[PDB]
Amino acid sequence: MGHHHHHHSHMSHTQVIELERKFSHQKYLSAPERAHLAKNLKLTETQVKIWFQNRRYKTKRKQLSSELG
């Protein structure tokens, strides 16, 4: 068993705006918020979780150095 289909989804520019509208209000999605945003954009919980992971990995975090993925 495992992930039947998995990669970095080539999502649409307007669809990424909706992801950033969700991100702007809350940086972390739980299973309800993630599935809700998924079905609204016809995405999967996986694809949405990969996106919110990457944006928090690409944003300026307080470490030894600025984490810009």
PDB file of N, CA and C in Angstrom, residues 24-47:
ATOM      1  N   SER A  24      -2.375  33.059   3.940  1.00  0.00           N
ATOM      2  CA  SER A  24      -2.336  34.414   4.546  1.00  0.00           C
ATOM      3  C   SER A  24      -3.057  34.465   5.905  1.00  0.00           C
ATOM      4  N   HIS A  25      -4.212  33.784   5.990  1.00  0.00           N
ATOM      5  CA  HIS A  25      -5.028  33.720   7.216  1.00  0.00           C
ATOM      6  C   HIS A  25      -4.462  32.688   8.224  1.00  0.00           C
ATOM      7  N   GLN A  26      -4.086  31.493   7.725  1.00  0.00           N
ATOM      8  CA  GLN A  26      -3.529  30.398   8.562  1.00  0.00           C
ATOM      9  C   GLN A  26      -2.403  29.650   7.795  1.00  0.00           C
ATOM     10  N   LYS A  27      -1.243  29.515   8.444  1.00  0.00           N
ATOM     11  CA  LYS A  27      -0.026  28.921   7.838  1.00  0.00           C
ATOM     12  C   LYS A  27      -0.067  27.381   7.829  1.00  0.00           C
ATOM     13  N   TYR A  28      -0.812  26.811   8.786  1.00  0.00           N
ATOM     14  CA  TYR A  28      -0.938  25.350   8.964  1.00  0.00           C
ATOM     15  C   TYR A  28      -2.398  24.912   8.737  1.00  0.00           C
ATOM     16  N   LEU A  29      -2.613  23.928   7.851  1.00  0.00           N
ATOM     17  CA  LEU A  29      -3.922  23.260   7.699  1.00  0.00           C
ATOM     18  C   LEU A  29      -3.911  21.896   8.417  1.00  0.00           C
ATOM     19  N   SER A  30      -4.966  21.618   9.194  1.00  0.00           N
ATOM     20  CA  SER A  30      -5.255  20.252   9.688  1.00  0.00           C
ATOM     21  C   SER A  30      -6.038  19.492   8.604  1.00  0.00           C
ATOM     22  N   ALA A  31      -6.332  18.206   8.856  1.00  0.00           N
ATOM     23  CA  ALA A  31      -7.086  17.329   7.918  1.00  0.00           C
ATOM     24  C   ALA A  31      -8.432  17.955   7.387  1.00  0.00           C
ATOM     25  N   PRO A  32      -9.324  18.574   8.254  1.00  0.00           N
ATOM     26  CA  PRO A  32     -10.545  19.286   7.767  1.00  0.00           C
ATOM     27  C   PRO A  32     -10.256  20.456   6.782  1.00  0.00           C
ATOM     28  N   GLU A  33      -9.365  21.404   7.173  1.00  0.00           N
ATOM     29  CA  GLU A  33      -9.041  22.613   6.350  1.00  0.00           C
ATOM     30  C   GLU A  33      -8.347  22.233   5.022  1.00  0.00           C
ATOM     31  N   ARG A  34      -7.532  21.176   5.092  1.00  0.00           N
ATOM     32  CA  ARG A  34      -6.730  20.668   3.972  1.00  0.00           C
ATOM     33  C   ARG A  34      -7.617  19.968   2.914  1.00  0.00           C
ATOM     34  N   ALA A  35      -8.558  19.126   3.391  1.00  0.00           N
ATOM     35  CA  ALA A  35      -9.547  18.424   2.536  1.00  0.00           C
ATOM     36  C   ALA A  35     -10.581  19.397   1.942  1.00  0.00           C
ATOM     37  N   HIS A  36     -10.990  20.381   2.753  1.00  0.00           N
ATOM     38  CA  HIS A  36     -11.922  21.443   2.348  1.00  0.00           C
ATOM     39  C   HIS A  36     -11.332  22.306   1.209  1.00  0.00           C
ATOM     40  N   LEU A  37     -10.088  22.782   1.393  1.00  0.00           N
ATOM     41  CA  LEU A  37      -9.376  23.582   0.370  1.00  0.00           C
ATOM     42  C   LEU A  37      -9.072  22.721  -0.883  1.00  0.00           C
ATOM     43  N   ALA A  38      -8.764  21.425  -0.652  1.00  0.00           N
ATOM     44  CA  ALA A  38      -8.538  20.439  -1.727  1.00  0.00           C
ATOM     45  C   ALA A  38      -9.760  20.336  -2.663  1.00  0.00           C
ATOM     46  N   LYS A  39     -10.922  19.933  -2.115  1.00  0.00           N
ATOM     47  CA  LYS A  39     -12.163  19.719  -2.905  1.00  0.00           C
ATOM     48  C   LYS A  39     -12.676  21.024  -3.576  1.00  0.00           C
ATOM     49  N   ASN A  40     -12.480  22.180  -2.898  1.00  0.00           N
ATOM     50  CA  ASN A  40     -12.817  23.518  -3.453  1.00  0.00           C
ATOM     51  C   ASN A  40     -11.990  23.848  -4.724  1.00  0.00           C
ATOM     52  N   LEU A  41     -10.713  23.428  -4.743  1.00  0.00           N
ATOM     53  CA  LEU A  41      -9.809  23.630  -5.906  1.00  0.00           C
ATOM     54  C   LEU A  41      -9.668  22.333  -6.748  1.00  0.00           C
ATOM     55  N   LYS A  42     -10.445  21.280  -6.380  1.00  0.00           N
ATOM     56  CA  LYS A  42     -10.400  19.919  -6.993  1.00  0.00           C
ATOM     57  C   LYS A  42      -9.027  19.200  -6.819  1.00  0.00           C
ATOM     58  N   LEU A  43      -8.172  19.751  -5.933  1.00  0.00           N
ATOM     59  CA  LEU A  43      -6.860  19.167  -5.561  1.00  0.00           C
ATOM     60  C   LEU A  43      -7.028  17.982  -4.581  1.00  0.00           C
ATOM     61  N   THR A  44      -5.905  17.343  -4.215  1.00  0.00           N
ATOM     62  CA  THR A  44      -5.872  16.303  -3.160  1.00  0.00           C
ATOM     63  C   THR A  44      -5.240  16.879  -1.885  1.00  0.00           C
ATOM     64  N   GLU A  45      -5.572  16.270  -0.725  1.00  0.00           N
ATOM     65  CA  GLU A  45      -4.965  16.625   0.578  1.00  0.00           C
ATOM     66  C   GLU A  45      -3.427  16.580   0.517  1.00  0.00           C
ATOM     67  N   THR A  46      -2.890  15.593  -0.224  1.00  0.00           N
ATOM     68  CA  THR A  46      -1.449  15.466  -0.484  1.00  0.00           C
ATOM     69  C   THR A  46      -0.875  16.736  -1.157  1.00  0.00           C
ATOM     70  N   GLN A  47      -1.432  17.117  -2.329  1.00  0.00           N
ATOM     71  CA  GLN A  47      -0.966  18.290  -3.129  1.00  0.00           C
ATOM     72  C   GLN A  47      -0.985  19.608  -2.313  1.00  0.00           C
TER      73      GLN A  47
END
